[PDB]
């Protein structure tokens, strides 16, 4: 809609920003690529960009950035070689060539897996050419996640930066930088698969499960707005979420930008903690409102008994309008309690609808729903309740033993699943708790709805290509509201029988002792999960002597001078006694 | 102290066979086991092979299923028996004197040299 489309995106994002945003779409579509190959591109196309700066009329300034990449994308020689059938592509016009390439991205590419470097050797080339360490970072990561919405990864780096920055000029950088790149990879890896969940369940839920979302999130975000306010600012949000799928990278940059643009020019019927984020710039402006801070719930709210329990015309309204008085209800009940997590609410709205459809066609309405109020505690105190409890027991226990403390737990839910999933989800789980626990209760259950969101469908779809549990399948056929409650509701596996011994699992060598603190924690919690399973019935009195009498075999053996008769020596006489002990 | 003397030891072909002796001068108590060490050239110190208890034998992964390890528990002597030789076995091959609880050296071997040719 300008007159050098090439020309005005490059004035509104800078030389820095548009220079990397091409290079992480050219990672995208062209996985398999050298590094090398993708700059002379970036350089290419951003020098075109020069010259349409310096003059709008020049040759191809007139044409579309869709199609100014298209035809770039066309014009390596391998094209064909090593992308087949994408070469065809290209006979294609646009818009029919650009959806042409999205169906090539390689979701699971066969790249190697990324090694981290010593601090030492990254720190070295970092400081000998900072734009080519960060822009082989961008390099790597975009071709192994082709949908990574590119001004998100852009941020990472932002961020991958500051901390090269700061911690490679401290002493005993390790204990700074390490700590830093984990943290990020992790945040990194979970922003991949909420962006995924975000288009999955919007697909397969339906437009109106997705709304019903966002209606609880934005009036915790914005409980000052009123509801009309707020329900078009979810019409909206779903449009940009439903382009952002697509995959089209500047579709999903201008709609962000347009509600962006409309959220600044009304704070003052929308919320008043975005005069900070209205002055950032065209990437940063959407970004930084996405993470804005609840605002002040307004003062002296009126209680929802009266629009809602105590009023002779209400069963009306519902059929006056079933989703918008539903909507009503979880927009007023949302602002009042942003401390409730979005399925929580969803909950008790699903709650208070299923009382009203049966409630209404009885003789007494107004008698039949009168205590629908009382059937949200049993909701509300149970969440609040798992996480004050789980939280106790992070902060007696640390992260690692809180790990283990769940791995127990979750083995004797459901015995039946692989070892690796049951560690992996459990690890995991103790970085949420380490993650939120830090947070005051009425922060910790929006801290973690949306990391435990993932973490329960990772498990899911894990779980969904070989299924094993027939209690795991019942809980992930659930809807997303009830699939959290379903796993916690499970106990103990009464009819599990216990897995045959193997002296294999339990046997361990000197390699132990020369694997990091992470990989070395995971294989003793590989072993927990499997002798849990060999024994299901064992207390946590008899496992916690186990896993302590394990921590000082290792200990021992990997302090030792004959390293290989230690653990063969000890671990004989380890699981001899364990095994003796258990029965 | 108690000293160690390796014997056998020489120039073998890939694929032969070797018998290594180590002798020592004193008592072996039933607490100290005794096992076997090479060095390969240009290479640290590796773990080869180690026996216990009289029964308990230990090998390394390289060595598992061709080298066995005994003890005359009376001459103070344990065996090496090397079989199906490979070139990588080119090493210094010291026998040690370990303790148990502790797993930790208390006499070497002055070694014996074991080249393995083609």
């Known amino acids: 809609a300008h007159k050098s489309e090439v020309a005005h995106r490059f004035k509104d994002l800078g030389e820095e920003n548009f220079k990397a945003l091409v290079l992480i779409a050219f990672a995208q579509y062209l996985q398999q690529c050298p590094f090398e190959d993708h700059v002379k591109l970036v350089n290419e196309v951003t020098e075109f960009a020069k010259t349409c700066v310096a003059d709008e009329s020049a040759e191809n300034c007139d044409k579309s950035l869709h199609t100014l990449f298209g035809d770039k994308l066309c014009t390596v020689a391998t094209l064909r070689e090593t992308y087949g059938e994408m070469a065809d592509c290209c006979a294609k016009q646009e818009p029919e060539r650009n959806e042409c390439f999205l169906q090539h991205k390689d979701d699971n590419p066969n790249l190697p897996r990324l090694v981290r470097p010593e601090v030492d050797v990254m720190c070295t080339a970092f400081h000998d050419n900072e734009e080519t360490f960060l822009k082989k970072y961008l390099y790597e990561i975009a071709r192994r996640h082709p949908y990574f919405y590119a001004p998100e990864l852009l941020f990472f780096a932002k961020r991958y930066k500051a901390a090269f920055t700061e911690c490679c000029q401290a002493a005993d950088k390790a204990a700074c930088l390490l700590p830093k790149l984990d943290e990020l990879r992790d945040e990194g890896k979970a922003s991949s698969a909420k962006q995924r969940l975000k288009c999955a369940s919007l697909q397969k839920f339906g437009e109106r499960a997705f709304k019903a979302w966002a209606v609880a999130r934005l009036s915790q975000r914005f409980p000052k707005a009123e509801f009309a306010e707020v329900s078009k600012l979810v019409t909206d949000l779903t449009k940009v979420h439903t382009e952002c799928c697509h995959g089209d990278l500047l579709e999903c940059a201008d709609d962000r930008a347009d509600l962006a643009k409309y959220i600044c020019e009304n704070q003052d019927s929308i919320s008043s903690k975005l005069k900070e984020c209205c002055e950032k710039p065209l990437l940063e402006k959407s970004h930084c409102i996405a993470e804005v801070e609840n605002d002040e719930m307004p003062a002296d709210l009126p209680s929802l008994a009266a629009d809602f329990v105590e009023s002779k015309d209400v069963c009306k309204n519902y059929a006056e309008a079933k989703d918008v008085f539903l909507g009503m209800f979880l927009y007023e009940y949302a602002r009042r309690h942003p401390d409730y997590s979005v399925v929580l609410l969803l909950r008790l709205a699903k709650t208070y609808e299923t009382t009203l459809e049966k409630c209404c066609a009885a003789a007494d309405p107004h008698e039949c729903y009168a205590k629908v109020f009382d059937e949200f505690k049993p909701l509300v105190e149970e969440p609040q309740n798992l996480i004050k409890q789980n939280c106790e027991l992070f902060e007696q226990l640390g992260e690692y033993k809180f790990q283990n403390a769940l791995l127990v737990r979750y083995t004797k839910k459901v015995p039946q699943v692989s070892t690796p999933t049951l560690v992996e989800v459990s690890r995991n789980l103790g970085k949420v708790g380490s993650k939120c626990c830090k947070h005051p209760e009425a922060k910790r259950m929006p801290c973690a709805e949306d990391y435990l969101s993932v973490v329960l469908n990772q498990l899911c779809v894990l779980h969904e290509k070989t299924p094993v549990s027939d209690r795991v399948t019942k809980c992930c056929t659930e809807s997303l509201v009830n699939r959290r409650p379903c796993f916690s509701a499970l106990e103990v596996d009464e009819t599990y029988v216990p897995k045959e011994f193997n002296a294999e699992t339990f046997t361990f060598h000197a390699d132990i002792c020369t694997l990091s603190e992470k990989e070395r924690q995971i294989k003793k919690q590989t072993a927990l999960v499997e002798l849990v399973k060999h024994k299901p019935k064992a207390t946590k009195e008899q496992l916690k002597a186990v896993m302590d009498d394990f921590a000082a075999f290792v200990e021992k053996c990997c302090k030792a001078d004959d390293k290989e008769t230690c653990f063969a020596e000890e671990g004989k006489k380890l699981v001899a006694a364990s095994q003796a002990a258990l029965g | 102290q108690v000293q160690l003397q390796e014997s056998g030891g020489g120039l073998v072909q890939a694929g032969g066979s070797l018998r290594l002796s180590c002798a020592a001068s004193?008592?072996?108590?039933?607490?100290?086991?005794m096992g076997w060490y090479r060095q390969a050239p240009g290479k640290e110190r590796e773990f080869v092979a180690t026996?216990?208890?009289?029964?308990?034998?230990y090998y390394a992964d390289s060595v598992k299923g061709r080298f066995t390890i005994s003890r005359d528990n009376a001459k103070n002597t344990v065996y090496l028996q090397m079989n199906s030789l490979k070139p990588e076995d080119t090493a210094v091959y010291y026998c040690?004197?370990?303790?148990?609880?502790?797993?930790?050296?208390?006499?070497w071997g002055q070694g014996t040299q074991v080249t393995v040719s083609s």
């Open positions: 040690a004197v370990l303790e148990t609880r502790s797993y930790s050296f208390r006499y």
């Open positions: 004193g008592y072996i108590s039933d607490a100290y086991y």
């Open positions: 026996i216990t208890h009289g029964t308990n034998t």
